[PDB]
Paper text:
The Phe231 to alanine mutation, which destabilizes this interface, slowed desensitization recovery of GluA2(F231A), both in the absence and presence of TARPs (γ2 and γ3). Transition into non-swapped LBD dimers probably involves relaxation of the critical M3 gating linkers of the B/D subunits, as observed in an NTD-deleted NMDAR structure, thereby entering non-conducting (‘deeply desensitized’) conformations. Closer analysis of the three sets of desensitized structures reveals a gradual transition of the LBD tier into four-fold symmetry, which is greatest for GluA1 and smallest for the edited GluA2 mutant: GluA1 > GluA2(F231A)-Arg743 > GluA2(F231A)-Gly743.
AMPA glutamate receptors (AMPARs), the primary mediators of excitatory neurotransmission in the brain, are either GluA2 subunit-containing and thus Ca2+-impermeable, or GluA2-lacking and Ca2+-permeable. AMPA glutamate receptors (AMPARs) mediate rapid signalling throughout the brain, and orchestrate various forms of synaptic plasticity that underlie learning. AMPARs exhibit a modular architecture with a two-layer extracellular region connected to the transmembrane ion channel (transmembrane domain, TMD).
Residue numbers in the entry:
A (entry chain D): 569 to 617
B (entry chain A): 520 to 551, 569 to 629, 633 to 715
C (entry chain B): 569 to 626, 636 to 666
D (entry chain F): 5 to 43, 55 to 84, 93 to 162, 173 to 210
E (entry chain B): 765 to 773, 785 to 823
Write the structure that this text describes.
Amino acid sequence: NEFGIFNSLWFSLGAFMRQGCDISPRSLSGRIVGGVWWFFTLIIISSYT
Amino acid sequence: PLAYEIWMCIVFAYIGVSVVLFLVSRFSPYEWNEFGIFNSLWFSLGAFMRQGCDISPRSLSGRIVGGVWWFFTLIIISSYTANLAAFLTVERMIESAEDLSKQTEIAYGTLDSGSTKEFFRRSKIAVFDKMWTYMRSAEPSVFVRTTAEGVARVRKSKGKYAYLLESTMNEYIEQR
Amino acid sequence: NEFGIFNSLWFSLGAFMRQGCDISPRSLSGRIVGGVWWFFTLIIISSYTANLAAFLTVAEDLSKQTEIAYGTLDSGSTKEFFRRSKIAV
Amino acid sequence: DRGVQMLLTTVGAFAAFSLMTIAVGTDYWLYSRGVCKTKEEVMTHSGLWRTCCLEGNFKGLCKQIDHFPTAEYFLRAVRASSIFPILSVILLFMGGLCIAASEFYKTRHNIILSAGIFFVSAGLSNIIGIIVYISANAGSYSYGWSFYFGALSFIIAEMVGVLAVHMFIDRHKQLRA
Amino acid sequence: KWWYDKGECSALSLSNVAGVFYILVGGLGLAMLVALIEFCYKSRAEAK
């Protein structure tokens, strides 16, 4: 898992700005976190635009 | 912005797209990370949320599945954003006496013996004369005997009744 | 350069749908092609979404087309006026 | 364990077949406000074939839906006939037959793959059917329990299909051992 | 009196996007067909 704290913060920031990831959680729990953050980002950015 | 059935069918389609991507990617024995059922569910979810991928199908069948899921995602997400915008844009935009005189389905009346009835009766404007003809002919008698009677009649007519009265009483009522 | 004809088509489709890449041209010329396809995709998809947002927010055929049928009262000033007329229409 | 996979696959297949059949049969698809029978308005079951009155002057009376009153005509045709839900039931049945023949006349190892393809296809047919139904109705309301039985049929069928494919994969791994 | 006095006259729905669903399921089917064809072909080749 290349997901230390610094890498975790980068993954989240990037997901919010709708940009690339360069790493994606591979475990079940990490994937759950990623999915909800993705949905949150979609709704919030669509609403901004 | 999207109907309930659209969300339901988006979920059913997600399960189907994932299962078919797993089947086409792993069923053949002449193909022995790659798309197992778990990885395939992840690929599809990520595609719908437009949030990029870590792997992508490499075979013709996998790419057909991926392509249709991508097109579906583009149309649905674009439509979500467009309809949300329409909601907010429109939100940023019968309400007069003439509109009331024109509408004969809605019933309007006044106090039986009062300045309002006399004002309509002795009026010379066309709108008020049309209203007076309507009231003088509108059976049953739209006229009431008390202001509170008209208040209750409006509050108890499913919005099929309107009451004409002085503004002070309305200001008191809306404030109470 | 892993861009064969099949992989080129996949890259282009994925770029139009604004989706994942998984391979990106590395050469100067490949990057020119990719850049213009990216710009084209941005303008065309932005305009699809914008025009859907508009769509979702906002005859004389009689003689100018015989498919529609027209007629008049049998005994009337209308039939006589047409019968006594001399104008083209 | 490998022995339990066949039980899970078979019991799932039976459940999916039963759910889809019940849904195609029962009448609780859409709680609408319609006419119980003509020659004013009340809540109605409106299943796939017959719309039946409830909460009415004569609650309980059921009649056949008048599907008809060019793309619209073709949709009406595909909806009046329930080719898609019916096809889903047929496919699930054949999938069950394959699972059953997995043991008798064993060692073929392709009959399991056939079971999986059949289950997945039944799922796709079920979804197309649902979309045709919902699109046909429109042009308040609520969806009954048969509609959700159909949906559960789709989910179980897809899961049974995944198990089938997994079993086929394992059989070839053993054969290649 | 006899003319004017007698005057007497949003959420996308599956119907609006059904086509994209039809295309999706059509594609899923085509994909399954292509895969099965490849499997049958490569199976015969495995005979020899």
